[PDB]
Amino acid sequence: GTIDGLNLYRMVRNNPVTLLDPDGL
Amino acid sequence: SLPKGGGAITGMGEALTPTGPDGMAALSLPLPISAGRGYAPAFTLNYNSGAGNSPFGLGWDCNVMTIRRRTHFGVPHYDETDTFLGPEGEVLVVADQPRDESTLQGINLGATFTVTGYRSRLESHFSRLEYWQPKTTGKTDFWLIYSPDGQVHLLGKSPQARISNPSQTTQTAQWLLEASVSSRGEQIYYQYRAEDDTGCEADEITHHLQATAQRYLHIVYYGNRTASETLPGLDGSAPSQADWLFYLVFDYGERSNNLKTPPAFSTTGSWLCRQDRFSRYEYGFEIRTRRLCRQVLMYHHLQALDSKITEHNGPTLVSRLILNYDESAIASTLVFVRRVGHEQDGNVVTLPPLELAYQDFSPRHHAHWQPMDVLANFNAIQRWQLVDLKGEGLPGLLYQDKGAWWYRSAQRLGEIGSDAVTWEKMQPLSVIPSLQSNASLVDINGDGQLDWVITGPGLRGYHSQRPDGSWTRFTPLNALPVEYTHPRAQLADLMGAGLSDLVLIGPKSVRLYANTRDGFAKGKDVVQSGDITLPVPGADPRKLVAFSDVLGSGQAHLVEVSATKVTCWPNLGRGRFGQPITLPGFSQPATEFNPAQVYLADLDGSPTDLIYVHTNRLDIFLNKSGNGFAEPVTLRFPEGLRFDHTCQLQMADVQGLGVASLILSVPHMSPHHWRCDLTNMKPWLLNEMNNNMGVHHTLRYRSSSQFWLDEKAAALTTGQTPVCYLPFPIHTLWQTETEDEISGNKLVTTLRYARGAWDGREREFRGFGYVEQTDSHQLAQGNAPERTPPALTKNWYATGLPVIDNALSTEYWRDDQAFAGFSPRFTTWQDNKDVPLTPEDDNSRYWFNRALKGQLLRSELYGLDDSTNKHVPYTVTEFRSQVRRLQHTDSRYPVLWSSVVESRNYHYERIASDPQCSQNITLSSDRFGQPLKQLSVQYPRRQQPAINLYPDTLPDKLLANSYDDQQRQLRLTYQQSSWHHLTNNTVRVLGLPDSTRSDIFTYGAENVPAGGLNLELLSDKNSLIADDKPREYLGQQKTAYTDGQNTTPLQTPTRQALIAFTETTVFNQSTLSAFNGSIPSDKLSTTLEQAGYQQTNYLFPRTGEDKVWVAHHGYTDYGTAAQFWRPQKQSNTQLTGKITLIWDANYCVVVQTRDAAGLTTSAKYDWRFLTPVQLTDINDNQHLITLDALGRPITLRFWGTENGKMTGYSSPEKASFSPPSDVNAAIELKKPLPVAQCQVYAPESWMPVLSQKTFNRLAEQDWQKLYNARIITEDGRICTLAYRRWVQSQKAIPQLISLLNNGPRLPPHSLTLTTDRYDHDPEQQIRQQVVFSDGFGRLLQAAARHEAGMARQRNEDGSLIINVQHTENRWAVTGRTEYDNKGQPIRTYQPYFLNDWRYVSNDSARQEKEAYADTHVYDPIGREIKVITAKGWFRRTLFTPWFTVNEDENDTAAEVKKNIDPKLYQKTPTVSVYDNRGLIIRNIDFHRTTANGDPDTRITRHQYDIHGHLNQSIDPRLYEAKQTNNTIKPNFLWQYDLTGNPLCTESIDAGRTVTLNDIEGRPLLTVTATGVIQTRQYETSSLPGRLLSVAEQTPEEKTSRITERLIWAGNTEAEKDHNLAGQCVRHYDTAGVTRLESLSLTGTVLSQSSQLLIDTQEANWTGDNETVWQNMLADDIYTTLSTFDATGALLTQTDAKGNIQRLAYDVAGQLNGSWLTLKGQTEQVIIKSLTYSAAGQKLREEHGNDVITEYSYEPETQRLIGIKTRRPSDTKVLQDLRYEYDPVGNVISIRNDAEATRFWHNQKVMPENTYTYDSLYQLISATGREMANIGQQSHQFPSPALPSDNNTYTNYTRTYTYDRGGNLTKIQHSSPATQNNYTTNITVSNRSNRAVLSTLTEDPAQVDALFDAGGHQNTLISGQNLNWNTRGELQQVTLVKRDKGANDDREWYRYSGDGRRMLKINEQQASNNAQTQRVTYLPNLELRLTQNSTATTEDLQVITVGEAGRAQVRVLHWESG
């Protein structure tokens, strides 16, 4: 749900070099 | 159940009691009392600066619930006229009318008693009292108390439990409490102890006859073994020890007081007599107190609690509380408290003692004569008086000049706040004193009450036939027996014809001169009396007769002073005088004695003392508690002085400290007047404390009289005159210095009092009307210079006097927009409704306003900083009080109730224009005080002011963006309640909840009246809560009570008040509308009741409302009264089975719990503390812990069954382990250890411990002197407080100690060990952890030993060496934190490695500069406002009433002048806007890319409804699109039920999901966005209600399909052996079934299996036959079994094909090496060694390929800066990445110092990768390197660069563009060399966030067709369709569709229940090589299978070692192909 902002399709807060997503949650 | 290492023993934490109004100094100490069954005595050791002497010392008290006769008058008459005081100390009034009874609690009494009910006039607890008087004489009387919670207390039936006059047994003064009983049946019986002549010396015995009235608490019985509703001992019999389980014993020196032997319950010892023997003398008879409590012991009945053990000696001591004293003949004071516990082995363990210190009396090092330069003009040296006339607080100069009386009051001298006192100009005093006659009373300025008595020669009735000197003199009347107005008994005959003159000899001592006595002209030196006559004053001219309180009782006793003996006739009230008391110690020559040189004044402030004036000196005599005088203290007069009868010497309190001073007057010398102060600080007050854990307090007192001089001075700076209302000085607490001996931080608090009050009618102290608290912070050297401002709390209390309480509204902080001020509400109680009334007469006004006393009226919090808003308060609060009149039966007093009906709260946040106002109102309360109509009010935000007062460093128009329509709303939360109560003559249970109902009103901001809302506005007819105005339903609640027999709810509960269940509304008609379209109308009621919901009428209903849906919860079954009604069975809801509780024999604890499914939990306890010590769980595994004598876990063991075998930690019978007590030795304990954890406590480490060798260097008598003075305890400890005052006082120490100055001292620490495996030989080793604490119990640090490495070092003095050096013990220190005295962490240090475990002194590494530490700053509220990092950046927070500005490190990066674009991140802080409810409604962000472009406002809006749940949310881009179209659905619209369970989730991205929650909170029916319904099925009502199966059904499907099946393990023994009990053995998920074959002791999966379905079958598990399910599976069975260590870490794992991974662990529990053993092969090494950093991150790693990886971390920030991966075989750097960050942590730089590989022809340099971000921290630009032959980026995977291609790489550069909602919209790729620049576009929808590749469409309004209802993309790319599972899962992908319906190139997958992909199958339909890859995903195993339709082409196995993404190792294994 709304655990990672409101963009349900955004990837790692548009900061791919710094962050990462382990399980897709 | 018990601590697993996360807790410790509660820090004693004896914080000072606030005691706002009275201003005294208080303290609380808890006695070590076991709660037992739950009913225990409530006792506390209470210090109070106003308390006198007690059986515990001066200023101490241990109050017991008593009831006594009123001592306001002289003495009780013991007639009906006297009045009783309650336990609180309030006067009582008759309730109802008396009655005659003779039976009580089913026990025949013996007489016809007349019962009179009694209640207090001012009622707080609403308890009811009864007085039981026997009509027929011969029996005793007693009292009863009916508590509002059903308790009954018996007070004073047995003669041992009452205080009576030994002469007349009928006279009773205090009814001590005898017994008590609870509603359950618990009983408590107290047994007191009368006074004996044991131990006391003969002179005490002979002087004090009839000294048997005093009572001392001795033994307290509770925890009765048999249930009974009767008060124990109601017959008058002695308590039977067999009947009780717990004993609370107060020792007085009878038992042993040593640390070697434990005291026994049955003692034959001797009572001890104190030195400071004293008497009370207030009830008309001597109440001689001669004893002191030396110990408080708790004894447990072990033989009755546990039948397995027998008590030989008797009840066994469990907790010992030692009380040592500072015994002296003047007064005794408590200066030592220590908790002690004796072990079973005879050894004892001890907690650090508590040291207290009081002020001392030294009149030879503090007194020297000083002239009063003030009185230079004062020419009158012979006749004047230093007495306080008006009652200001300090004595003024009373004199007559030129034949006219004058008086000069006291006045401040110089700087305000200085104790210097001077006197003002003389004033007329128009009242002519010579008007009245001799020995008459005159008033002051015509005041109400007669104050003084005058005696003058020129007055009438004067006959002094033998005088030396005489003049008109005044005296205080209070210094005489109150019966002077009309004398009786001895006072009538002693005064006789009259009194000639009354002359003072002290502050309250008066010398008597009898008139010429007519009727007996001889006038002999004695007048007859009943007991050896009485003397006559003045007759014998060599003897002194005076009225002086030398006994310290409170009454003017008669004193006769002779040359060789003192004689005191005590006062007994009503002019009675007791037998003489010879007071020895004083004796002067019989020839030289003169009574004029005798003066009596209290100099120590403890009984009056004696001073004899000589010509050149004076001698003092300290009164030893009314039992004599000590040796004289010679004080030299001023040099060159000869005192004679012409001079004068007056004793008065010029300092106002309560102790007299020496005022000298000499005619011939200059200056004429002198002064000598014997003490500048009042003695015998607690001013210093230390708990020897690192905390040391310091109290400082200041007199209230000096405060009045300051309040008068400040009020003299203005043109007004203040009035004082405190006649006597009160030594109020002034400052409280709190010092931490570890952190050096001080916390000096300052208190300021003003507007003191005193009641002249009731002679009571009301309190101050203003208290000013100020708490400052002073930190040690080397700390940060950011000093936190000292807060300021201005509090106004109602004193009960209308003269002060009316004028207290001026000192307030004014506000033009404030709401209406509060005035008290006076109502009566008529017809069950508060009827307001205006006070009737001045007598009624006095009683009403008096009830308001002690109530806080206004509270303002100020921050005292240099900021511009320093004059503005943070929060402002004020309360309205109500006084309800209850009855008018008595003419003297009416009965009232004081309560706070209205409270108001302000949150200015130092912003006066825009406050946050809130207010709670109580509209009505019942007759017993319970509320009926409460109301919470959230006020609307004020209009935006024309003058912005917010700071100007905020972004652009942010203040204008802070305003929302939700803020401008008036919210009235109106709740109604009903209560049950049992009103009976023998039953009283109050405040029982019956039913509640909450509603909420919603009005516009224009409905607020000008002055605000009050109770009168709301009581009107048109008010906003009238019964006709609309409202919103919030819910309702009702409590059901059972009688214990049947579950049927009754109408009125019983005395036991058992709660059957709790009912809570969940649904109504309006909330149910969220099921339309998802649930029909007919099956809704059927499915709602199927879930368990029930219907019932509205509580407090209105017209047109019916049948809300409720849920009952909290079911409990209770036993019979013979079991104390303890619960037998409990249940959550009606869908789950009950749990059964099996209690012990005594019904104190639960020993066994049979769960719903029959699994049991057995508990074995320790009865010293009644806490579990050995538990048996569901799988019959034994968990065991052992405890110390104090209840602290010391060892941990467990054992049980794994795979059927019996393995575990060796039992205490298999292998016994002696727990070590030393910390250094337990570190040197090696393998093996049979315990899981070994705890070593060392809390007394802060006290120095001398070695036994230096103990031999110090002789016995030298130790005898130190052990005598309590400076050294019996063990090897030194008292910190006793040492410091022993170096200050008696400064020369007779022994040198080498441990005080620095030396080996450490804060309170504790060791913890942990084994990792069992006895059968492992790697083992010991995991050692050392935690450090402070005086407040906060973790200073924690140390953990590692295996080996290099590290800094610690010096032996406590300092840190920055040089790093190799050492054996790594001992990493983490969590290093420095706390102030309030708990807030001000410094946090990064982790590090140092040898040894000893603490590093704070001041050493404070400014070490190399040690990296963060700095925090806090506001007076406790919120963090500034955080300074190690690098120097600081993130900040700005708090406002309506928003909170959060600036990150880049936001404050501009203000660092003291990365790439500091101006870019300027003014971009996250701003969260709050409403009046305190909910986040807006989240404001600022977008900016260039250092010049002004930012974009990113506003995200969240709307909360009136119910308070998150209703709507809309992102910025849809908000912008909505401002042009209000018909756009927001990003999220949630519907909830009344409780808050989300029912409907309406999202434009992921569709609409509807879910029906169960009553236990379980997912019953879930409807997805596509339309599929998911129904879940649970176990029957008689089971834990776990899940059984899950059924799903699409709209296309007609019958459901069971996709998941659950099969839970039984209770059979065969399943306990594999530890399977309570677990799901077989789980039939959609992919396949996972079976649980075995479990470990720690619960980890030993052995499990998995079996997959066939590809041509869907997961549908119909029927209840388990065999048809096994027909759909595959023959391949994948079983993964593994083994674990004791700490739940994986050692070995076996895959499905037989490969094993071995994982060894280090001493720190971190993996230090990995191994891999292929099947049929040898064990080859994967990870050789593994070293880690301080913070636990990986540091260096060497693999089996012999290639080493080096990690580098930023020591300031613990961030990864570099990765070096070199291979030492050829010394070639394969990869050297080096990262660089910005202050937030975004990756901006990635350089590579490694030379490129051989694949790249003619390439040696690797270009740098750099990145830029916007303020929103989205990746804007990136410069990477791409190989030349990549072409355009597509889903197609590129081709590798083979070494023969001579391939090259070229730099590229991408720039990204982002939607305002976060969607990526464009990628501008550009490579300058390869000339292949392309652009990738993403079309985003107009109404959602669904965005696809531009090639699919460029139309926004067409994208929503490319997505399903659930939000899944139905088409990946042109020609590739994606089908999806019923669980939002990617079912199948079609790669290349082939025509004519043929089978195509497709891929499809299969996942488990938790979503993990277990299967992947790809298909190719090529004509040449039709191949189908099949991959099966298993734990650390991949099964890749490629098959042609001809034969099997390839069989591959992939083995994974480690987790993915963290240096995982892959091993490909081929069977074929």
Author numbering:
A (entry chain A): 2133 to 2157
B (entry chain A): 13 to 618, 620 to 1471, 1482 to 2040
List sentences from the manuscript:
Tc toxins consist of three components: TcA, TcB, and TcC. We therefore chose TcdB2-TccC3 to function as a cocoon scaffold for translocation of other cargo proteins, which are not components of the Tc toxin system.
In case of the wild-type TccC3HVR, the affinity of TcB-TcC to TcA is in the picomolar range, resulting in almost complete holotoxin formation. TEV protease is not an exceptionally stable protein, as it unfolds at ~ 52 °C38. Therefore, we believe that these domains are more rigid than the native Tcc3HVR or other translocated cargos such as HVR128-iLOV, which might prevent the protein from being translocated. To prove this, we determined the structure of TcB-TcC-TEV to a resolution of 3.7 Å using X-ray crystallography. This is the likely cause for TEV not being translocated. As folded proteins do not fit through the narrow constriction site of the translocation channel, the formation of defined structural elements such as β-barrels in the cocoon probably results in translocation arrest. Therefore, a third prerequisite needs to be fulfilled: the encapsulated cargo must not form any tertiary structures or stably interact with the cocoon. The two abovementioned cargos violate this prerequisite, with TEV containing two highly stable β-barrels, and Cdc42 possessing an amphipathic C-terminus that associates with a hydrophobic binding pocket in the cocoon.
